[PDB]
From a paper:
The viral RNA dependent RNA polymerase (FluPol) is a key determinant of viral host-range and pathogenicity, and a prime target for antiviral drugs. A direct interaction between FluPol and the disordered C-terminal domain (CTD) of the largest RNAP II subunit is essential for ‘cap-snatching’. We show that the CTD, jointly with ANP32, enhances FluPol replication activity and we demonstrate in structural studies that CTD-binding to the FluPol is consistent with replication activity.
Finally, from a similar de novo reaction mix but in the presence of all NTPs (lane 8), we obtained a structure at 3.43 Å resolution of Zhejiang-H7N9 4 M FluPol in a self-stalled pre-termination state. In this post-transfer structure, with the PPi reaction product visible, template U17 base pairs with A35 of the product cRNA at the +1 active site position, with a maximally taut connection of the template from the hook to the active site, as previously described. In all structures, the pS5 CTD is observed bound in sites 1A and 2A. Finally, all structures have the CTD peptide mimic bound in both sites 1A and 2A, suggesting that both replication and transcription are consistent with CTD-binding.
Numbering used by the authors:
A (entry chain A): 1 to 63, 72 to 716
B (entry chain G): 2 to 10, 16 to 26
C (entry chain B): 1 to 637, 654 to 756
D (entry chain C): 1 to 249
Amino acid sequence: MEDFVRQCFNPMIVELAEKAMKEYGEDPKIETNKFASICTHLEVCFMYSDFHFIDERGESTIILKHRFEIIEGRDRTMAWTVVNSICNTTGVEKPKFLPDLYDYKENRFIEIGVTRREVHIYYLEKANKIKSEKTHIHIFSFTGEEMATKADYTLDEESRARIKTRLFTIRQEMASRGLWDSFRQSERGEETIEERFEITGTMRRLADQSLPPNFSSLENFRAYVDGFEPNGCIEGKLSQMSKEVNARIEPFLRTTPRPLRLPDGPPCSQRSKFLLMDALKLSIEDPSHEGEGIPLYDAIKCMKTFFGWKEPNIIKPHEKGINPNYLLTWKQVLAELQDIKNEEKIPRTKNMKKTSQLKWALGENMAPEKVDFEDCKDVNDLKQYDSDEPEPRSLACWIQSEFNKACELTDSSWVELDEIGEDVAPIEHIASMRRNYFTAEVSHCRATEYIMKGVYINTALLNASCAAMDDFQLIPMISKCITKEGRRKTNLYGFIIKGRSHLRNDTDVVNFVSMEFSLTDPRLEPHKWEKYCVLEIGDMLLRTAVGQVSRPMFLYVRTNGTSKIKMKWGMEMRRCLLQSLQQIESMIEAESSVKEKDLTKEFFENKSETWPIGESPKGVEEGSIGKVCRTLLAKSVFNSLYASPQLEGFSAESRKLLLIVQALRDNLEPGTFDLEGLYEAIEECLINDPWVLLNASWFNSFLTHALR
Amino acid sequence: SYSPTSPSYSYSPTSPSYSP
Amino acid sequence: MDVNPTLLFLKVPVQNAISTTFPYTGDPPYSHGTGTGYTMDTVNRTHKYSEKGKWTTNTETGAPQLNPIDGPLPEDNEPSGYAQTDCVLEAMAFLEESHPGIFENSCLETMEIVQQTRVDKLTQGRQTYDWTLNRNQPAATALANTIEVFRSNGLTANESGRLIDFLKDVMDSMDKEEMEITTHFQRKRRVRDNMTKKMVTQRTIGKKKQRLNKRSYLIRALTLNTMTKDAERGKLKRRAIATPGMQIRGFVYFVEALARSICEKLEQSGLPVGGNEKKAKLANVVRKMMTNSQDTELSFTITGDNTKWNENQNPRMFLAMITYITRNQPEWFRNVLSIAPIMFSNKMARLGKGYMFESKSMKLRTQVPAEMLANIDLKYFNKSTREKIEKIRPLLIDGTASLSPGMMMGMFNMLSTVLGVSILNLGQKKYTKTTYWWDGLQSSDDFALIVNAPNHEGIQAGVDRFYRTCKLVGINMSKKKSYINRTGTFEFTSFFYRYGFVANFSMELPSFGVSGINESADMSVGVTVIKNNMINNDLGPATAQMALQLFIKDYRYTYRCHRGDTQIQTRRAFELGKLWEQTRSKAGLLVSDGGPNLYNIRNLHIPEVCLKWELMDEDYQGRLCNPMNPFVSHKEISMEYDAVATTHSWIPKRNRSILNTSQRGILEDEQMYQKCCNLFEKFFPSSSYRRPVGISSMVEAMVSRARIDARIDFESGRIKKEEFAEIMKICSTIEELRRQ
Amino acid sequence: MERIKELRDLMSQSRTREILTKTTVDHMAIIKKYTSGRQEKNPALRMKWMMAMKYPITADKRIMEMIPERNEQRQTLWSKTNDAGSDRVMVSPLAVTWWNRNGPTTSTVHYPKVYKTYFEKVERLKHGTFGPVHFRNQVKIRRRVDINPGHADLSAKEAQDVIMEVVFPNEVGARILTSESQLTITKEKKKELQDCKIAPLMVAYMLERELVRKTRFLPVAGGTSSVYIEVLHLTQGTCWEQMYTPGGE
RNA sequence: AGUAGAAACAAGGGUGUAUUUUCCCCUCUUU
RNA sequence: GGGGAAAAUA
Ligand SMILES: [Mg+2]
Ligand SMILES: [Mg+2]
């Protein structure tokens, strides 16, 4: 029947009918009666609308403003927007359902209906459905019977006769082919939309293959599940199940936990991007010279104020490194600085000459050339990249001393926080005084010095790497502090030569060479300086309390590397402050609600309340709120500095053990299922990271002091 | 006003004085 | 003295000080190379947990498939994927019985969604696998390529716009003997860079024609690309994740809609609720179980995580669950909701990028694709990769490993949660038939399970019964992860409950900082984040003030908008200073203009422009909010709409260049699409506000709109006859142009 | 007239004609989002390192007609772009500051009108009265409250329908306004929005802010109305309670 | 060498899924 | 309606 409609109706009409019928997910080869009905309706609507225009006077004419605007055949959105526009302009009532035509001469919507049964039934049905005495309804029949609203047939007798003869011809064609019976009998359900989604072909066989073992086809499985009822299947299967499949609760008594088993090997060495406790800084007081903000000029002034430079020499060679290259790099830095000092208009930034020493130190031309595999098939000596595990390293005593130093109180302020709005609410005043306490106790902590140092270094490295990708750039490690006298002081820790920084992935690394002044003899703890190559670069005349003492001043020179993510999280190191302060504040609040008053002054000034924070040969030691705040800040800062997968894994797998211990101390009768498995999981994360090893030792001490 | 203090507190080896 | 932060737990309970156990101030672990190793490990582990199943050969894909369902019952505590179909069906029957009408209403809602959903709904997804180019591309690009290829192949059923029509289109495509597609081809030319004087391989990418047989297209359609999850906290070792093609995302979306509908009507499901809602749900469950417990009754809480949750959920059990849920429903609904498990039971995991091989003798390195790993000498890999390849070799076809078992890393989170919740509710008094009983909450894999029994032996029996039932259905409880204590304290997905959920501020540290969108946007985001953290995660007043100070410092440094009255110097400093000496009201300037920061605890919820509006000077206020600021885009009604946004809402410079690569021929398509979309938006004013719908072509709709607008304008009288005639003639020629 | 001529020009081409003919209105959503090239991650880092560059902003070429290339200190503001289709231009924040300190000034600004809700918030805060603070153990109940009061007589769907009717009368669709309050609000907004010079989308968004009601699950203790939830951060604490009375009625 | 860690960078295509919750924003587009 | 950022699990 689709062929007949295609061969009879106009191509425009057939295409429009197909478009209208497909909008609701209808196929035109199987659902053919609806297709023919839509085609006939569209043809009747077009003939009704066509051949009728409005003259400039405003009267109907037959051969310019069209008399009838067509609304049928357009998409739902297009039809509804045209209807809305006409309704808004002409001011007529908005039809509840989508009409077919609009008459401008009388300004009303007209519904065109083509039906096969008697006209009165269809007219009554349509009138009841629309239920509005504002839109005209015109029913046409293939038998030659037409009915209108109030018998008002606006179309001229000639047009109605033409439509009637067209419908009669269509009906005669239907009858001649012996298909008018189905066409007449299918009209009842044409208005109903039935969804079809049948699995056939490849997908049917795929479904047949996705069933439990004892099924052969999807319909069989569907029939089985449809008739499925529950009768003791779970109980029977459980009875058949072996009793060895169980979850035995092993009590977690005070004698159950055991210390973690730290790894064995050579002591772990320092891996920070810069010295923490061994760093020496050359300082200038109240910088008011030329520049005052450019790192190079500040470095120049810092180096100028110190007299006593001597010939550098290797004292602690890097075992795997070419120490002469490090020596020549330091000499080249000194020569470049002198050359710049010679010139008048020193630039904001400097590029170091790509000498051989910098070529080797910065790892230039070390990566094998990358070639697409299509042109690498003929090579017979290919080997997969190594994926060996990290070398185990034992816990060393220097990391504990470094953490102890990081928690110390400093004389000079290290962060000068910005202003905020005026305080009006009482809560605002309480916040202000508590913030004053926290800032006083935190701005004078060495952890804040490390925060500022790392933030500045990472920011400068990122800026240099992105701005200059092909230049070996010199970056002095500059920091700003305020001494106990309140005078701005500019400190220089050394220099960083940044190599090529063509970073594409977040994990790509930039090699650089760090040279840091120090007063720590590398031979006291050589294992701590495995990767460095320490030089004795001067003799510093320190002003001791008793008097003046001459001490050697060394330069720790090493090659390090960092990535875009590492630099990014280095810039965001001030957040560490919050991680402590928040907690500290909570603690204070956690006590204040108990005493119905703010205990900040009591906690900070009188130091009446102390928390167990340190271990001594005498025993566990209690520190005041300030000490706890500094300890938490240092812990967070070291987390930032010594971040690694090992730290994350250890924290994740040890929070469970900490919570179990807390439950045991709460007399909640804690229980475990594979506590040995948990211990193995925790110990798998301790390999070589000094920070992780220190944390594991800390956890062992906590377990020892908490089991009792 | 609040000056931090530590009951646990030569030449400050990290930040010494060297000006002649 | 040796400072020991951990010893602080001696006084403060761990939960109250849990924030210090989270090292969220450091960079999270990242994957450095290919995820092929992790994908192979996951495939091998999934096949090892169910190796006792039945091996078969797919008659379409021709790849081995493992069916462990109804396999031998577990003998030990090791992970097992041998779920029992009858047990799962009984669990779902009891779920329906305990919540009568849940499945019927869920199915009705899902039918409503299916019948009234649009194809473009698939563009919400992130990077998706593309079979046309065999690589990861945005969801919109993937869907556009799929639709273009289908249209070129004659399968134009998706023109309707309904998603179900697109799924029928996928069904039809899966039956074509051969498929013609438009892949990307590469041309390599050796060139000399003028900045380094070194030879490089410039690459040009263009379009070509390719033909795929039935088997190749079927493999690609079922393919799920695999990569490595990055920036994941709390794991020493990484793991692989999967992204499916565009032929699988629609069915998965429908199944997830049904599962979400089911989970909404369940008090034991942790999804889709989250944040405060999930905490309230957990607190309600715990409080109700504690209250209902008799004084003599003993109650114990288990905090539990499941081991290899994704690798032990069989798609066949998802199909069985779907079939049972959709009982007494139209056949089409059952088919559309059951197709997704059908494809997931026959999915193929693409290994990934491949590997990197270095020849030190020749000083060379290369990247082997995953396709060549099946025909490579086994001596080149190291030991562990040698075992992986030797074990996974039987499943390789066209660079993909067949993996029937397993749910592939969170593709059915909601359905898996439904199964877990059914196992949870199987513990009521009417089903245990014993003094002990259990209940609780589950989300994906994690669960909190409270068990009550008269004595310790009853609690032990209840725990054993729950463990065995989970094993029967296919859920494996990770003994090392889980622990049990007396009710009152527990943990659920980083929410620590100790007689009340305790705040964990360490999780929200990364949100702090500068978003880097633009000055005003960054400031607003910062202040709003501080306020929200104050409200929710127990950020103190003073701590909030210090966070505000730090954010202002970082923002000022990032945007070089330091205070005007400051000695500091920078590129922007001179202009800010000149503005500063020009303004009489010094408190009206925005921070981006070097003005003072007036924000405090009181007014963290007020935008800066509105906060500083009153104190702004008339001339500065006009300049800042000028209607004709050039830095923001303008929309034509050559008159243009007046702008309202401040000049600080500029658009930053975005770059998309690829090292040694040109894509002009591919970006011209995007340019043409953008031009056509802009012209349509010009024709239809509401397109930007709400997505338009319709089956008519763009040109047809636009010319029809123009005609109706001209007619209506004439009727209202806004135009005379001449413009009417001109518009009608131009529309008619546009019509004939299109037609011919 | 201009738009139809532009459509004819676009139809004149071949590839554009194919795009316009073979793409349906629905698929316009797919091709609107069609994007090629790389996607940049870590917006924070990119902004952090980009702003140090000379020209990190992109503006329309119109900026060339008002912003001078340099200021009195010879500092370049914008530079001609080579990687653009002649419609954009690189711009420095120096340009933004120059516009803010010497740009054209006008007495008419749409900010107080579009963002009237935020100004109402400011007025409520300004006239509020602050009481004392009680340091007492605070109990928090997690419940669903309203963060945007919206219109009491209008629901979410009713508000959306009203917004669609007011802003886009000719595309409302089959929806019909039923409630009398809906009609009153629609005609009032129509009257207030006559001859407005703002884009229809932005007017729709401000109407959404003023009318639609937004609810979120928050831990509250005490007040529950919108005027209190917005200030919840200031009047509620884990250990302290702050008495407050917003200036609003 | 160094970074780093089950696989890579150390130049010559730049890789980031599903579900849920919260926050912000309103328009990108040619070496 | 859409797009970005943060977190959790998978
Ligand atoms: Mg798990
Ligand atoms: Mg889990």
